């Protein structure tokens, strides 16, 4: 766990690990995963994650 | 003791003289409700915010004024205790 101002007044190990779960999830949401969320144009006329699109792109065909 | 009760009398009297001031034990509920009620009197005042709501909804300014003054009674739900 990074020692940051969010953990001020946390003395118990269980509280630090837990608080960590919620904080990790929140920064998870605010951060934007481009590849995980971007929408790419299937040439027929479909939409799929940019990561899958580039993978398949090379992936013999796409 | 003396401080607490003289400041308590001064705050109760200043408040009964000005509706909406506060004192060191004002609760979230009274704060928020006085703050609504003032918003309401001020919408009915400024001739214009009235026009804004009466166009956003599609009511007429008399009906809008009436609903505001209806709500000014208990605007933030029923009290807390």
């Amino acid at each position: 766990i990074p020692n940051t101002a969010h953990f001020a007044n946390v003395t118990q190990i269980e509280d630090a690990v837990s608080l960590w779960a919620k904080l990790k999830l929140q920064k998870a949401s605010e951060r934007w995963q481009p590849d995980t969320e971007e929408e790419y144009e299937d040439s027929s006329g479909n939409v799929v994650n940019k990561k899958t699109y580039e993978d398949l792109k090379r992936q013999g065909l796409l | 003791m003396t401080d607490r009760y003289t400041i308590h009398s001064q705050l109760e009297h200043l408040q009964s003289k000005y509706i909406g001031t506060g004192h060191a034990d004002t609760t979230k509920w009274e704060w928020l409700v006085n703050q609504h009620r003032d918003s309401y009197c001020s919408y009915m005042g400024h001739f214009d915010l009235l026009n804004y709501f009466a166009i956003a909804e599609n009511e007429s300014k008399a009906r809008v004024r009436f609903n505001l003054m209806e709500k000014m009674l208990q605007p933030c739900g029923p009290p807390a205790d």
Binding site: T4, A5, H6, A8, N9, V10, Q12, D15, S18, L19, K22, L23 | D25, T27, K28
Partner: protein
């Protein structure tokens, strides 16, 4: 019993950080409020200004500051241009044993504003000696740092080699700071600088065996007018 009832329902600092959307904002004392939730929400709003730090300090405010000696107040330089320092010294010294156009120009023609803190800058004991930090910027330098290095200060500092630019070009820049660009190392030598080994050289451009730079680019390979301005 009622005080104890509120105490019994009182939250831990961990619980108050937990439910609350922002947990840092939460101080050890906020748990003692009537409403933990409203107080943390009010400390978690933008542009608000936190309560001054010395509310709990058992000692007094600037009474605690006390003991060291302080130099007398230093006049704004434009008042100092008048020299009223010298006139006061001469009259005072004679007793101890000024024209008016300069004063009017000093107040209007050449008076300029100081440096002032924006909203949220509270004063606290030590803020005048607080060390300005966080400046992770490699480009910013000093004149005391340049001189105490023996490196030139002023407008030639850019062509005055920082002694660790040669170690930047030798081990890479400081590895904790990949984002560090060094002029003449990852950006071109500044204007009129010259790479070289003579007193004042910029070393040799960091280079691979095909002719591309291993760090940055050692050679350097809208309508911003305001709207309504006076004339």
């Amino acid at each position: 019993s009622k005080k104890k009832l509120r105490r019994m329902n009182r939250f831990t600092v961990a619980e108050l950080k937990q439910l609350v959307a922002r947990p840092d904002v939460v101080e050890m004392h906020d748990v003692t409020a009537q409403d933990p939730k409203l107080l943390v929400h009010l400390k978690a709003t933008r542009n608000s200004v936190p309560v001054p730090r010395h509310w709990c300090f058992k000692r007094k405010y600037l009474q605690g500051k006390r003991g060291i000696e302080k130099p007398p107040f230093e006049l704004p330089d434009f008042i100092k241009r008048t020299g009223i320092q010298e006139m006061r010294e001469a009259l005072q010294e004679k007793e101890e044993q000024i024209d008016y156009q300069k004063l009017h120009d000093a107040f209007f023609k050449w008076q300029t504003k100081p440096k002032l803190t924006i909203h949220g800058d509270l004063y606290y004991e030590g803020k005048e000696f607080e060390t300005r930090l966080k400046e992770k910027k490699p480009g910013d330098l000093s004149d005391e740092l340049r001189i105490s290095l023996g490196m030139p200060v002023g407008p030639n500092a850019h062509k005055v080699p920082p002694p660790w630019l040669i170690a930047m070009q030798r081990y890479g820049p400081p590895p904790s700071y990949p984002n560090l660009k060094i002029p003449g190392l990852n950006s071109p030598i500044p204007e009129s600088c010259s790479f070289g080994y003579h007193a004042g050289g910029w070393g040799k451009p960091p280079v691979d065996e095909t002719g591309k730079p291993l760090y940055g680019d050692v050679f350097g390979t809208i309508d911003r007018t305001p709207w309504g301005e006076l004339e």
